[PDB]
Amino acid sequence: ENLYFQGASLTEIEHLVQSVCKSYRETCQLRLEDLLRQRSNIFSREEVTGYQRKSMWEMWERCAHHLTEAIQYVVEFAKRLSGFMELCQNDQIVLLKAGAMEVVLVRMCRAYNADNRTVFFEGKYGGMELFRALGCSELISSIFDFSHSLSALHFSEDEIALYTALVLINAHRPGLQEKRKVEQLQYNLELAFHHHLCKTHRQSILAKLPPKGKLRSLCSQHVERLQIFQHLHPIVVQAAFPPLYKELFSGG
């Protein structure tokens, strides 16, 4: 079914590095240079007040739409990753349901400016106060703290590519039917990531990567806050939340 479901040679691992980085480049959503250039475009006090005056439901709908757009690029990244399309449909869906949001949270560090603690949102950069109408300040604070931590690593785009491929191809996800196939693909992607780090004298970032429990806790908090919002505005979720968002986070 795929070369990377068995033992891969050093030459095949070098091919895997190139292939992952290419798949990431073609699905990164926004170019890094385009995000860095826009750092000087910052929401004014008046604009921040405008976002804070939005209703909780309108802010939740807007943020769910933006997360769904980011998730669609991650689905395409997964489809282009060596071996992913050769997994059975059950497993492709298990990996995407568990890992798409984790990949989005990692990619988000590219849009976060640690100099002023702001994130790109709807054309400009804003602090966590921009999202106060959501009524989930712990979750926003946790996401900003996470982005701040990854921003201190100074990830290159190729490092984000290799790291997010591994975030997705995780053989420990519950529900996997072909667990051994996923383990071998994960082993080869782990060699590709570690080979690239070795070659670029960046192996010191491995001990600094966040624990898997950290990405899990953020995803769990997101689902918990969505459940709370859904109890308050069930018809908003039913009528105006994106279908893909509901499939991933509310079971339909």
Binding site: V75, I93, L96, L244, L248, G252
Partner: peptide
């Protein structure tokens, strides 16, 4: 009962 994932996966 939203099932967009299988559609995105199957679309080539």
């Amino acid at each position: 009962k939203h099932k967009i994932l299988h559609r995105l996966l199957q679309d080539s």
